[PDB]
Design a protein around this motif. Structure first.
Motif, short mmCIF file in Angstrom:
data_model
loop_
_atom_site.label_atom_id
_atom_site.label_comp_id
_atom_site.label_asym_id
_atom_site.label_seq_id
_atom_site.Cartn_x
_atom_site.Cartn_y
_atom_site.Cartn_z
N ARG A 122 -6.70 -0.30 -7.86
CA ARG A 122 -5.62 0.66 -7.64
C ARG A 122 -5.97 1.60 -6.48
O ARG A 122 -7.11 2.06 -6.38
N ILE A 123 -4.99 1.87 -5.63
CA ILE A 123 -5.16 2.83 -4.53
C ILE A 123 -4.04 3.87 -4.54
O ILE A 123 -2.89 3.53 -4.33
N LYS B 191 -5.68 -3.86 2.10
CA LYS B 191 -4.83 -4.75 1.28
C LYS B 191 -5.67 -5.75 0.46
O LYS B 191 -5.30 -6.13 -0.65
N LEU C 45 0.84 -1.18 0.00
CA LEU C 45 0.00 0.00 0.00
C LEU C 45 0.89 1.24 0.00
O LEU C 45 2.03 1.19 0.44
N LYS D 98 -6.85 -4.07 -2.69
CA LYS D 98 -5.82 -4.02 -3.71
C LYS D 98 -5.59 -5.41 -4.31
O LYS D 98 -5.39 -5.56 -5.51
#
Lengths: 93, 93
Positions: free
Chosen positions: B89-90, B81, B14, B84
């Motif tokens: 997408r982060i 998590k 992340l 993702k």
């Protein structure tokens, strides 16, 4: 003298494709939490008991009461909404 | 017969800017959960009591034992998590 004041996340929009995946996420959160309890000696019991380390959540996610699965999906969604509120983009790759 | 099997998220990375905000997120998750308990008539008590709806978590996030805040930050991070891991997408806007 404690009054919880949670952030207003009612206007935070997540992608529909992610919300669709709520159960999947909640399930994993549950697995993580169940494994941690079990590692400390906790076992299933129909009634919660701290002295004998009994907890009714120690069952497969799917066997949890619906209301509980619902709370879990909401907790997961609210966590992710918090992220978006804090200034992060969330998009399906 | 139940063996929890959480996703392997040890390779999910992340953004550092987000992890830095773990406490903010964990705090809000706590505010939401505390408001819900209090809504159902739960009150603070030093020892957890289901019959009398006493729970020691009903205090400001900051006053929680360090281990509980730690669990809470981890629970929030693992949730994110999972997102993702599921193909989202982060990114900081």
């Amino acid at each position: 003298d404690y009054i919880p004041e949670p952030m207003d996340l009612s206007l935070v929009d997540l992608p529909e494709s992610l919300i669709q995946l709520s159960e999947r996420i909640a399930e994993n959160v549950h697995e993580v939490a169940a494994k941690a309890r079990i590692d400390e000696g906790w076992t299933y019991g129909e009634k919660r008991d701290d002295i004998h380390k009994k907890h009714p959540c120690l069952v497969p996610y799917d066997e949890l009461p619906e209301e509980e699965k619902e709370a879990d999906r909401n907790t997961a969604m609210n966590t992710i909404k918090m992220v978006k509120k804090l200034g992060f983009r969330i998009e399906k790759e």
